[PDB]
């Protein structure tokens, strides 16, 4: 390796002898894990078993823990160089993966297409590279270094095509040749590759006939529990290539590992004058989301056979809240709901919680929202997180007139937990009227006419007017809700 005075062959041999002859007992004794008594999960060649699993499943990526290199003896300097020179180390890492797999295929007599193995590109995803470094502590000596970071992503760009292999066609003889592209530079041929033509300046790039890979920049935000309270959490630009695309939706609290790299930014697009800022990013190599079964069916039949299953489920609805037995029973029935009869019949339950202001009115709401798979909790008066109705807005970026969905839609089957149901605006009251009566939301604005199927369940909770609900006074005179919506 240039710039490090490190031979590639010795590193490849170290990782090769680390692949086999290495057992998870090395990991168990490296961390001084007292539960080293396990033998099958420790003394077995874990990497060999992973190779067997990959061969029988035909996958590409490999999730390697950096601690395993410390566990092995000859791969300590390998770990050091990986921390220092991740690019070349990872390249030879994956090359040795492929070579060891083909060698294992040859040796174990496991018949398989060798060309299939060779053509397939196999990846390594080294995680747990180091301590939980803070992105605020990114001093500029971390360039070209493998870094572990923690944070919650803000947003994700769409799929970005980056051209990997060029495709030039000779416009005077229809000779098509492909040029490998490294570091994003065009090494266009000087003349036609065919000798009978060999015409210079006769090659035009055929954009749709080239080869393209997928780049997806993500916007990572520092996790709240580690950012200083005085200052807002900062943001970084994640880079995703060739895999893990859409593996992280917006809002995911994840631990990322990747190579921290920076590139200059052109001061003027037409010129090559370069600003001295060197916009930074990270080339992600692994992401961990830190956050149906026969045995499950057996559990279902066991709980069904229980005589008190009704009461048991009612208690499990709100274990921390006392009394409210019939409330729990009704909520459970709503989570079950009627059959969605087809031929329209709702086949669903709408429940409202009136009465004097009680904290339990919201506590059981959060409990049921956690319980229900679908649906979303929402404050009808507030609607801060979700607008409670689907409407079209201009996204600012590219100024596109994009439709965003409300809380009612996407909550089909599940329960959309409503709070402050009395205090919500009359416009969303009419929207609720539409969704509860017609079961669909009809929108006609900005040249767009559409009907969206909501088919949601409603569990609302509204506080009354005044200090508290008046039992002598009727429900209508205290909850301040339109009689059609109430009924």
């Amino acid at each position: 390796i240039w710039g490090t005075n490190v031979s590639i062959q010795e590193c490849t041999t170290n990782f090769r002898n680390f692949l086999m002859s290495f057992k998870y007992k090395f990991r168990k004794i490296l961390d001084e894990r007292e539960e080293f008594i396990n033998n099958t999960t420790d003394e077995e060649l874990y990497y060999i078993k992973q190779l067997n699993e990959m061969r029988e499943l035909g996958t590409s990526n490999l999730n390697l823990d950096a601690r395993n290199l410390l566990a092995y003896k000859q791969t300590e300097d390998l770990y050091h160089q990986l921390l220092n020179y991740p690019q070349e180390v990872i390249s030879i890492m994956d090359q040795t993966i492929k070579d060891c797999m083909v060698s294992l295929i040859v040796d174990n007599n496991l018949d398989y297409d060798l060309d299939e193995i060779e053509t397939k590109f196999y990846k390594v995803r080294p995680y747990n590279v180091g301590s939980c470094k803070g992105m605020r502590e990114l001093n500029p000596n971390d360039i070209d270094k493998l870094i572990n970071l923690k944070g919650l992503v803000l947003r994700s760009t769409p799929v970005i095509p980056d051209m990997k292999v060029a495709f030039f066609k000779c416009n005077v003889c229809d000779h098509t040749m492909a040029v490998e592209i490294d570091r994003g530079v065009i090494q266009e041929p000087a003349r036609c590759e065919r000798i009978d033509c060999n015409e210079p300046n006769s090659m035009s790039l055929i954009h749709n006939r080239c080869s393209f890979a997928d780049k997806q920049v993500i916007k990572l935000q520092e996790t709240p529990d580690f950012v200083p309270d005085g200052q807002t959490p900062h943001s970084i630009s994640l880079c995703v290539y060739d895999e893990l695309v859409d593996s992280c939706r917006a809002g995911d609290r994840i631990e990322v590992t990747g190579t921290f790299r920076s590139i200059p930014i052109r001061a003027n697009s037409r010129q090559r004058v370069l600003k001295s800022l060197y916009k930074t990013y990270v080339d992600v190599v692994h992401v961990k989301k830190v956050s149906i079964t026969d045995q499950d069916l057996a559990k279902i039949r066991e709980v069904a056979a229980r005589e008190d299953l009704y009461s048991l489920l009612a208690r499990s609805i709100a274990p921390s809240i006392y009394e409210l037995e019939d409330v729990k029973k009704g909520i459970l029935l709503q989570l079950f709901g009627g059959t969605n009869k087809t031929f329209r019949y709702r086949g669903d339950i709408n429940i409202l919680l009136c009465g004097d202001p009680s904290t339990s009115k919201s506590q059981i709401l959060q409990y049921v929202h956690k319980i229900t798979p679908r649906g979303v909790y929402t404050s009808g008066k507030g609607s801060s997180a979700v607008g409670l109705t689907a409407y079209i807005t201009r996204d600012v970026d590219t100024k596109q007139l994009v439709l965003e969905s409300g809380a009612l839609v996407l909550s089909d089957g599940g329960v959309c937990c409503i709070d402050e149901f009395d205090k919500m605006s009359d416009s969303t009251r009419s929207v609720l009227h539409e969704v509860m009566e017609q079961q669909t939301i009809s929108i006609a604005k900005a040249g767009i006419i559409t009907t969206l199927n909501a088919r949601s369940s409603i569990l609302a909770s509204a506080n009354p007017i005044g200090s508290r609900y008046n039992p002598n006074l009727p429900v209508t005179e205290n909850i301040d809700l339109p009689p059609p919506l109430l009924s």
Binding site: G3, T4, N5, H80, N84, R136, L138, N139, P140, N141, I143, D144, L154, R155, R183, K219, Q221, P224, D229, G230, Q231, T232, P233, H234, S235, A250, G251, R261, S262, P264, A267, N268, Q271, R272, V273, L274, K275, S276, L277, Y278, T280, S320, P357, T359, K381, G382, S384, A385, D395, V396, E404, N463, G466, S467, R468
Partner: protein, 647 residues
């Protein structure tokens, strides 16, 4: 042509005297700066702080024995940029060898050095190569002169005098000056390239290009001797591994309110900090920054559009903030001064009366601790009061004494997104999140819109605010204790009118506050007289009429909270029993009262009582929650409830 001028500075003699100063300075181990340079060689330091006082003392010493100086202290205040490079070259010339076994696992620059040295040497025998800045793993800064109090400060030592932004005339360009001011905007840390380290595809050569222009052009042409003689015309590849980068931050410091003449507008100044001085500043900093004042140019095409009218910035060199011994001292205060009574008056010494409100303020400052969930340790009070009562002064005092304490009016928090179009930054703060581990003093809580109503609500049952600019749903933590200072609508409070009818706030939000007090003023014969006496004395002496113990420092409360946060006074079984019968009888008397319906006892009142008892024991050692603690908490709660029913 370029005309020439004669100037008596003598850079050569100055450099030689600089070397003599560095080698032969021993402050009142060996030389201090040789020790620092050896430590740098040990990789134990990469920050050379050149103190002006050391140079001045060296000049004082050698003046008595030969006058072998040219007033370097005054000579470098005229153009410090050249002397920075002079000091760098002097350090490199007198750079000691490492005297420690420093691990060279990451020695990429050393690897490049030895590799290129061997490559050059294998043809040198015929069988500067490196930039001076590239070899440097250190950075050099200047410490300004201290106060002189002598004839040497004969209007000289411009760095000793703290200037303001308006005092920075254009003639000061190139001088090492200092300013006193408050930051307003700090940028993020970014890698600014010092020297690029291009590598050629063939010819194997690596060429370095130093850049100080904020913008450059790539070489991409193998002008190396082998490539040129072979005419291979190789293109150069930029190499971050061998290139040199520096952490950079760009602050925007404004001038203080006192530095602004009447009828004027405060100005601003951009500061470019780099090296190890990055991340040393925050927007909420009032500092005396000393640095080099330089004319940042409009390099490019904009220079032609504008002309000789350039822009300026300060290359900062030094920053001085303005802003268990104390633990033993606060036990001494506890034993001597009765905190419950003495610190109550200490919070508002200039405010006469309402001592129980002051004690409630102490309890809020201490705060309960019930972080375990299955709640919250923030105590919240609302001061509806009465117009004309010094609620605003109490909030101002609380803000000036509570750490991370902020004050704002109901009508001006919230948050904003991408305020500057140019940088397009993300997630600007507000006012509620500023007092994250602090208290927000909300004056005019009544004159506060539904948007901020819901924001402060979400905060108070969540200890966190959230925004949904473009569906991002990002959130900012604000575990702020809520201190409201609304006032009754239509002016004066009406005792006959119901308290919730007197203020345009929802009853649900008001009940969720832990405690509330009616403190309204009533015209008397003596209380007004004594208050007038107090105000007149304050006007006489610019100080309070000290008639009792008046502690000043608020760090006593800091010690109390830090000490008892880990303690977490555990509620006793007797405590739980007494508070449960207290709730039973409170609800019973609330019903038997049913005169205002706001007097109903709620589990929220129980949570408030629990957190008040936690804060009470928190101020008083650990595990003081007992019959006495709950009695004090219930007494305070009942006093607050009867306050609403005053008269």
């Amino acid at each position: 042509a370029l005309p020439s001028i004669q100037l008596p500075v003598d850079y050569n003699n100055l450099f030689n005297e600089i070397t003599d100063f560095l080698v032969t300075f021993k402050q009142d181990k060996g030389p201090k700066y040789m020790a620092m340079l050896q430590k740098v060689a040990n990789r134990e330091l990469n920050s050379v702080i050149i103190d002006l006082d050391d140079i001045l003392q060296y000049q004082n010493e050698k003046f008595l024995q030969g006058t072998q100086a040219d007033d370097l202290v005054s000579a470098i205040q005229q153009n410090a940029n050249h002397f920075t490079e002079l000091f760098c070259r002097a350090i490199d010339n007198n750079m000691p060898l490492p005297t420690k076994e420093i691990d060279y696992k990451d020695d990429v620059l050393d690897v490049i050095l030895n590799q290129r040295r061997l490559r050059n040497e294998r043809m040198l025998s015929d069988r500067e190569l490196f930039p001076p800045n590239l070899t440097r793993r250190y950075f050099l800064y200047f410490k300004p002169l201290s106060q002189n109090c002598a004839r040497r400060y004969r209007k000289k030592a411009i760095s000793s005098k703290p200037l303001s932004v308006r005092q920075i005339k254009g003639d000061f360009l190139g001088q090492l000056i200092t300013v006193r001011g408050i930051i307003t905007r700090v940028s993020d840390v970014k890698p600014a390239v010092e020297v690029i380290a291009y590598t050629c595809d063939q010819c194997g050569y690596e060429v370095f290009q130093e850049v100080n222009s904020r913008t450059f052009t790539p070489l991409s042409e193998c002008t190396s001797e082998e490539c040129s003689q072979n005419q291979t015309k190789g293109q150069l590849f930029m190499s971050t591994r061998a290139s040199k980068f520096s952490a950079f931050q760009e602050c925007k410091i404004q001038e203080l309110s006192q530095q602004v003449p009447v009828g004027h507008i405060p100005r601003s100044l951009n500061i470019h900090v780099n090296g190890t001085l990055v991340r040393s500043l925050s927007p909420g900093d009032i500092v005396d920054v000393t640095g080099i004042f330089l004319p940042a140019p409009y390099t490019g095409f904009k220079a032609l559009k504008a002309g000789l009218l350039t822009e300026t910035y300060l290359e900062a060199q030094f920053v001085r903030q303005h802003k268990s011994d104390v633990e033993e001292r606060v036990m001494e205060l506890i034993t001597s001064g009765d905190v419950y009574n003495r610190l109550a008056k200490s919070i508002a010494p200039e405010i006469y009366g309402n001592l129980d409100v002051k004690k409630a303020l102490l309890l809020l400052l201490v705060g309960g601790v019930d972080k375990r969930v299955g709640i919250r340790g923030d105590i919240n009070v609302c001061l509806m009061g009465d117009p004309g009562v010094a609620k605003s002064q109490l909030l101002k005092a609380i803000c000036k004494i509570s750490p991370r304490g902020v004050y704002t009016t109901g009508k001006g928090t919230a948050a904003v997104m991408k305020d500057p179009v140019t940088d397009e930054m993300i997630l600007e703060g507000g006012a509620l999140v500023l007092a994250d581990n602090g208290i927000c003093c909300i004056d005019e809580f009544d004159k506060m819109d539904e948007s901020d109503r819901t924001a402060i609500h979400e905060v108070m049952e969540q200890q966190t605010i959230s925004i949904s600019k473009a569906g991002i749903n990002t959130t900012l933590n604000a575990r702020t204790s809520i201190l409201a200072a609304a006032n009754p609508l239509y002016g004066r409070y009406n005792p006959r009118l119901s308290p919730l009818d007197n203020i345009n706030l929802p009853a649900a939000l008001l009940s969720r506050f832990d405690i509330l007090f009616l403190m309204l003023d009533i015209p008397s014969r003596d209380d007004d007289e004594k208050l007038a006496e107090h105000v007149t004395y304050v006007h006489m002496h610019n100080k309070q009429p000290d008639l009792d113990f008046t502690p000043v420092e608020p760090s006593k409360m800091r010690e109390y909270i830090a000490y008892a946060k880990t303690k977490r006074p555990v509620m006793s079984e007797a405590v739980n029993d007494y508070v449960v019968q207290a709730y039973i009888r409170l609800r019973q008397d609330s019903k038997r009262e049913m005169k205002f319906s706001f007097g109903q006892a709620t589990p929220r009142t129980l949570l408030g009582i629990i957190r008040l008892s936690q804060a009470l024991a928190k101020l008083r050692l650990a595990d003081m929650v007992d019959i006495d603690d709950v009695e004090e908490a219930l007494r305070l709660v009942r006093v607050s409830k009867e306050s609403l029913y005053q008269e």
